């Protein structure tokens, strides 16, 4: 239905908006681009599923996210990746970890204040119908 198409369009608009607000925050600049594969060759095989906010925006546009649940799974992945790759006690790693927990916490906070639970539920019930 056109009504279902319209619902998924509203979700994409919503997710693009959350993602943009993350990507323009100076704290989250490191998470806006893939890890350059030369600058860092070991990334690839330490991190099984790389993920960044640019990839998130491409996945939105390719209609990969049918629920906010699915989108927050990728944000959790950016955070978990950052914590796993940068575990050390040194200030370099600790700043990334702090920033990666802040990205996570900010995304969940935006969604908690701005996503209608009835919109998320609709999205889940359409998704379940596929
Ligand atoms: C910080 N971590 C390594 S992370 O939390 O695991 C991570 C990182 C990234 N993305 C980046 O680090 C982007 N990035 C590069 O790979 N190289 C850049 C671009 C070229 C200029 C430059 C100069 C200095 C340092 C880096 C770079 C850059 O911005 C994405 C996700 C995660 Cl989880």
Keywords:
130 residues, mainly alpha, Histone Acetyltransferase, Chain A
Radius of gyration: 16 Å
* Topology pattern, helix = H, strand = E: HHHHHH
Shape field: elongated
N-to-C CA distance: 12 Å
Q: Which percent band covers the strand fraction? A: under 5%
Looking at how many chains there are and whether they match, the oligomeric state comes to monomer
Query: Structural class given helices, strands, pairing?
Result: mainly alpha
Number of helices: 6
Specify the CATH class. Mainly Alpha
Ligands and ions found: the ligand CN(C)S(=O)(=O)c1cc(NC(=O)CN2C(=O)N[C@@]3(CCCc4ccccc43)C2=O)ccc1Cl
Subunit structure: Interacts with ESR1 and NCOA3 and these interactions are enhanced by estradiol. Interacts with acetylated lysine residues on histone H1.4, H2A, H2B and H3 (in vitro).
Coiled coil: 108-130
Family: Belongs to the AAA ATPase family.
Domain Bromo: 3-114
Structure description:
With 130 residues, the chain is mainly α. It has a single domain, classed as Up-down Bundle (Histone Acetyltransferase, Chain A), CATH 1.20.920. It is built from six helices and no strands. Ligand KVZ binds next to helix 4 and helix 5.
């Amino acid at each position: 239905s056109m009504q279902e198409e319209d619902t998924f369009r509203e979700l994409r608009i919503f997710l693009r908006n959350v993602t943009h607000r993350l990507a323009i925050d100076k704290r989250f600049r490191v998470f806006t681009k893939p890890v350059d594969p030369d600058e860092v060759p070991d990334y690839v095989t330490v991190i099984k599923q790389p993920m960044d906010l640019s990839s998130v925006i491409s996945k939105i546009d390719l209609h990969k996210y049918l629920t906010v649940k699915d989108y927050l799974r990728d944000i959790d992945l950016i955070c978990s990746n950052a914590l796993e790759y940068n575990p050390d006690r040194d200030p370099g790693d600790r700043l990334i970890r702090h920033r990666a927990c802040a990205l996570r916490d900010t995304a969940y906070a935006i969604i908690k204040e701005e996503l209608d639970e009835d919109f998320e539920q609709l999205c889940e019930e359409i998704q379940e119908s596929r």
